[PDB]
Amino acid sequence: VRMNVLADALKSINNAEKRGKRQVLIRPCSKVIVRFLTVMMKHGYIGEFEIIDDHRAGKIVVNLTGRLNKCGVISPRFDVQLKDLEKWQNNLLPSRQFGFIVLTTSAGIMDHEEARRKHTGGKILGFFF
Amino acid sequence: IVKPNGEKPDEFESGISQALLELEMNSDLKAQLRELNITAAKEIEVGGGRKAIIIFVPVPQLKSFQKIQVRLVRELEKKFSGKHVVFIAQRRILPKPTRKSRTKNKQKRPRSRTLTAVHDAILEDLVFPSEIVGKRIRVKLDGSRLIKVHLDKAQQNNVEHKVETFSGVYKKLTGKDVNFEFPEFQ
Amino acid sequence: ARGPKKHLKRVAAPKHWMLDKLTGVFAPRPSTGPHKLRECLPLIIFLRNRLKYALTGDEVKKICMQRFIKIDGKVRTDITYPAGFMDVISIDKTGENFRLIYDTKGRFAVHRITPEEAKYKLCKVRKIFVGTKGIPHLVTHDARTIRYPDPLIKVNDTIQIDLETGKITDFIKFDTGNLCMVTGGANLGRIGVITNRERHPGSFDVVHVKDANGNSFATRLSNIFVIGKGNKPWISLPRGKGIRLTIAEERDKRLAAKQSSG
Amino acid sequence: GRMHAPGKGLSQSALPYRRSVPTWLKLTSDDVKEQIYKLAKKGLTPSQIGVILRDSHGVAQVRFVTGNKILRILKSKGLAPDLPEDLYHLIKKAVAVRKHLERNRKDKDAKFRLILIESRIHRLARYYKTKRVLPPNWKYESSTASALV
Amino acid sequence: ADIQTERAYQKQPTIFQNKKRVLLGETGKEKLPRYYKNIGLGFKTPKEAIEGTYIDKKCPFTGNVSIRGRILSGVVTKMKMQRTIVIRRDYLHYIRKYNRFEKRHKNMSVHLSPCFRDVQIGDIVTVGECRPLSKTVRFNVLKVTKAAGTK
RNA sequence: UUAAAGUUGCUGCAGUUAAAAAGCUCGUAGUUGGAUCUCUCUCGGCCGAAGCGUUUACUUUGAAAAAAUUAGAGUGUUCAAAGCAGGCCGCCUGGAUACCGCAGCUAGGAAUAAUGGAAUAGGACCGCGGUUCUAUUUUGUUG
């Protein structure tokens, strides 16, 4: 069955941008998906997107700008303390100059640098570079 | 006609009751308005100069109000000149319970009393007699959201002159940016 | 073991004694007395290791058996006697008086006092009960049993004791706004004003204390010793005045000293 | 896909975006409920009542008309039966397969289908007992099942 | 007598039942004064202990036991042996090579007082630590809360 | 015996033909599980003392955690491994600090994940009435 809808959301975006496409459809929509997409967008990786209402779990149309190398999910949502973040970013990010790990903390869904600024740990949702 | 919970009417929500008073016994709607009553009134500046009146009515009377809304709005816009009339049901929003709350949340909050649920009903009440056939939310680069609402063409020539007013009401009632479109077909 | 122990190994001795590794295998095991084994300074480690009046442990015995050292007004010839917090050591031959007060690093300081200040000491209150024929009884942190005290004195308070008679001359209650020193834990040797006390019935209370420079810390209620009423201490304070310096501040304060020299 | 079959069919119903009753249907909520009570007294299950209403009276959805569901209406009036309809129809099929199986002892495939049917019965019974619809001591007896049907 | 089903007369030691007062007191009513205490950590004494007539010395509210130590919670599993019950505690143990958890459980025998009536085996009970009451009993029930299927 | 061994693979391996998917299906335990919802009544002189908000998991903080060892600050053992000493012409000065899973204790956060809160209404909130036990203030004290 369909478990971890965010995994399907992130695998669909990765597979379309390998093909050089300009738009991708994501179903079903979810608020974790929307927050993750916003985090990706504010860093200049995807661009504007739009939610379609179905009186159900809606769907999303995302515009692609060709700037994405990889976006992936981590399952299960491991707990990350602020002293164990360096190992995670060494394991997952391609360099110390670019790439982001996306976590969910009690202050919101953010990336690994805003979490360091706010001095908080959380649970790892995924990564993108 | 005005029966607020705070029992405080003033110069402008008394005028709405005054206007309804003549129609009560001087229109064909004789027994279709005796048992109904409004609960609030307001005047709003929209479209850089225009004015729009929102009339708040009890929820249990909503369908009785909008069963005659077409004639009421038609006949209520003749007294005051160049102002759009909008009827909205008075709905309550119960705050989301938290881990630090008072013992007022004794019984579970109904989802009819949810913020999103009342914002999605305020829109339907605002857009009458037309119906909503679609809804889209554009998330833009700065992170802001814009709602795009598709309306039926059956009432297109009846409501399309009020679309600039509809956004003006919704921005203060809700706090959101909304545009209205008329699609091709279903 | 079939009975009580009589030895102490040097690595197992309390760290604030500041004993080196290669002097011997053993350390002085404190005698049984008013203060605990891990919260006391024996007389040998004070006469030999701190004041350097003696070079060996045999010389400490020669000073002691001449009846030169008085601990709170009484001559003690035991060289492992467990002196402790707030005690007064008097050497009449050289005219010296010392009070055992923790410094900011958690170690007993060489704090010299005046002959007038040596006539009293401050004692915490540990137990209050009623004995036969309805006589109230105190028990302090110094293992002093004082009967017929004031009825306003309660547990966790501080009293002043005149060492000649052993009677209470004044007292300070425990309340917010009163000066105190920490006598255990990680804030040992720190001085500050009580600001709050959170109560956990069936468990240990917690007291919040703020320094003069604005630094705040917390301790267990058993580690708090009320010194003075308000900001004014009732005893003379060591050099650091109870303020804990950071390692960077301490480094800068040390480097500034050698530049002054010339 | 299917629970007890390898099929992966997709056929189902597609509700419209309109949650609103159309203007050509003039039946009031109370009149719609009256037909529900009327057809409930002819031994019609809620799913039968729904198709009858849809095919004849132009009632696409009663949740859209009366703001309630058929089983809730029947239970409020007191016309709901003892066992739920889905569990009632599963036990009826188990008796039929088991009744065919005494005249046919060499029918090895009905013996497989009966196992599948009773597994489905146990699944629904577990779900309903967790929901406090069936008493906790309810148990499906392969021999006493005819008493339930 | 229901209260006197054992070979030895059952009474609360603190209570004296033979105060010869007057013939009228005999005529009026025979109801013994009862000893109950306030086992207190914010807990409240049930009213079935102040108004009951049971005699049991290992009850916290009307017996000779003191509550100190640890306050724990569990789920009632079995009620079979006289006047004591078996509860279950479920927890997660962390294995750090795999960065994961595993479910473990403990079965703990506690003493149940007659003041806590109408208790079934599905519900949450708070327990307080006391002195050894038997070979494998050290805790005592302090509060009863009904399970999910609450009536 | 450790690394090499990504040849025990949580990070991180393999199973068409090199070693390897049970003949097939059911089924309990175990593992995993789709959208969905934006703090206050009494008291001590505008604040605190006292109740919790359904309960947790999670995250940050605090105090409590033997020394030695390890990391690390100072210090020309003649250098160094060491040591805890030493420095100035009787004085000056150290003997720091960090780390110390899991479990237990404490205080902030509320995203993620579980859990409950009204459907024979034995529902919430307001004023109203009755049955019973009962407070020991008031009759300067005592009955």
From Swiss-Prot, chain A:
Taxonomic superkingdom: Eukaryota
Q: Which residue positions does the secretion signal occupy?
A: none
UniProt KW keywords: Cytoplasm, Diamond-Blackfan anemia, Nucleus, Ribonucleoprotein, Ribosomal protein
Cellular component annotations (GO), alphabetically ordered: cytoplasm; cytosol; cytosolic ribosome; cytosolic small ribosomal subunit; extracellular exosome; membrane; nucleolus; nucleoplasm
Q: What does this protein do?
A: Component of the small ribosomal subunit. Part of the small subunit (SSU) processome, first precursor of the small eukaryotic ribosomal subunit. During the assembly of the SSU processome in the nucleolus, many ribosome biogenesis factors, an RNA chaperone and ribosomal proteins associate with the nascent pre-rRNA and work in concert to generate RNA folding, modifications, rearrangements and cleavage as well as targeted degradation of pre-ribosomal RNA by the RNA exosome. Required for proper erythropoiesis.
Subunit and partners: Component of the 40S ribosomal subunit. Part of the small subunit (SSU) processome, composed of more than 70 proteins and the RNA chaperone small nucleolar RNA (snoRNA) U3.
Q: What is this protein called?
A: Small ribosomal subunit protein uS8
Q: What organism, scientifically named, is this protein from? A: Homo sapiens (Human)
Gene behind the chain: RPS15A
From Swiss-Prot, chain B:
**The UniProt record lists the keyword Repeat:** no
Report the locations given in the UniProt record. Answer: Cytoplasm, Cytoskeleton, Microtubule organizing center, Centrosome; Cytoplasm; Nucleus, Nucleolus
Keyword Metal-binding on entry: no
Keywords assigned: Acetylation, Cytoplasm, Cytoskeleton, Diamond-Blackfan anemia, Isopeptide bond, Nucleus, Ribonucleoprotein, Ribosomal protein, Ubl conjugation
As annotated, the Glycyl lysine isopeptide (Lys-Gly) (interchain with G-Cter in SUMO2) covalent link is placed at: K63, K67
Q: Which residues carry the post-translational modification N6-acetyllysine, per the record?
A: K67
A GO cellular component term found in this entry reads: membrane
| Any single GO BP term | negative regulation of ubiquitin protein ligase activity
InterPro entries recorded for this chain?
A: Ribosomal_eS7, Ribosomal_eS7_CS
Mod. after translation: Phosphorylated by NEK6.
Q: Report a single Gene Ontology molecular function.
A: RNA binding
Pfam families, sorted: Ribosomal_S7e
Q: List the disulfide bonds.
A: none
Describe its partners and assembly state. Component of the small ribosomal subunit. Part of the small subunit (SSU) processome, composed of more than 70 proteins and the RNA chaperone small nucleolar RNA (snoRNA) U3. Binds IPO9 with high affinity. Interacts with NEK6. Interacts with DESI2. Interacts with IPO5, IPO7 and KPNB1; these interactions may be involved in RPS7 nuclear import for the assembly of ribosomal subunits.
**What role does this protein play?**
Component of the small ribosomal subunit. The ribosome is a large ribonucleoprotein complex responsible for the synthesis of proteins in the cell. Required for rRNA maturation. Part of the small subunit (SSU) processome, first precursor of the small eukaryotic ribosomal subunit.
**Family per UniProt?**
Belongs to the eukaryotic ribosomal protein eS7 family.
Q: What is the protein's given name?
A: Small ribosomal subunit protein eS7
State the organism of origin: Homo sapiens
From Swiss-Prot, chain C:
Q: Describe the family membership recorded for this protein in Swiss-Prot or TrEMBL.
A: Belongs to the eukaryotic ribosomal protein eS4 family.
Q: Can you supply one Gene Ontology CC term for this chain's record?
A: extracellular exosome
- The chain positions of domain S4 RNA-binding read 41-103
Q: Which residues carry this modification: N6-acetyllysine?
A: K232
* Swiss-Prot/TrEMBL GO biological process terms: cytoplasmic translation; positive regulation of cell population proliferation; positive regulation of translation; ribosomal small subunit biogenesis; translation
Q: How does it assemble?
A: Component of the small ribosomal subunit. Part of the small subunit (SSU) processome, composed of more than 70 proteins and the RNA chaperone small nucleolar RNA (snoRNA) U3. Identified in a IGF2BP1-dependent mRNP granule complex containing untranslated mRNAs.
GO MF terms on file? RNA binding; rRNA binding; structural constituent of ribosome
TM segments?
Answer: none
Query: Per UniProt, what is the name of the gene that codes for the protein in this document?
Result: RPS4X
Q: What is this protein called?
A: Small ribosomal subunit protein eS4, X isoform
Curated annotation (Swiss-Prot), chain E:
> What GO MF terms are annotated?
RNA binding; rRNA binding; structural constituent of ribosome
PROSITE patterns from the xrefs?
RIBOSOMAL_S17
Places the protein is found: Cytoplasm; Nucleus, Nucleolus
Chief location of this protein within or outside the cell: cytoplasm
GO terms for CC? cytoplasm; cytosol; cytosolic ribosome; cytosolic small ribosomal subunit; extracellular exosome; focal adhesion; membrane; nucleolus
Q: Which Pfam families match?
A: Ribosomal_S17, Ribosomal_S17_N
Q: What UniProt keywords are attached to this protein's entry?
A: Acetylation, Citrullination, Cytoplasm, Lipoprotein, Methylation, Nucleus, Palmitate, Phosphoprotein, Ribonucleoprotein, Ribosomal protein, RNA-binding, rRNA-binding
Residues with Citrulline modification: R21
Q: How is it modified after translation?
A: Citrullinated by PADI4.
Give all Phosphoserine modified positions: S66, S109
Lipid anchor positions (S-palmitoyl cysteine) = C59
Query: What domain of life does the native source organism fall in?
Result: Eukaryota
The PTM N6-acetyllysine maps to K37, K44, K57
Residues with PTM N-acetylalanine: A1
PANTHER family assigned to the protein according to its UniProt record, in alphabetical order = 40S RIBOSOMAL PROTEIN S11 FAMILY MEMBER, SMALL RIBOSOMAL SUBUNIT PROTEIN US17
| Known function | Component of the small ribosomal subunit. The ribosome is a large ribonucleoprotein complex responsible for the synthesis of proteins in the cell. Part of the small subunit (SSU) processome, first precursor of the small eukaryotic ribosomal subunit. During the assembly of the SSU processome in the nucleolus, many ribosome biogenesis factors, an RNA chaperone and ribosomal proteins associate with the nascent pre-rRNA and work in concert to generate RNA folding, modifications, rearrangements and cleavage as well as targeted degradation of pre-ribosomal RNA by the RNA exosome.
Report the sequence similarity comment from the record: Belongs to the universal ribosomal protein uS17 family.
In terms of NCBIfam families, this protein maps to: PRK08572.1, uS17_arch
The gene name on file is RPS11
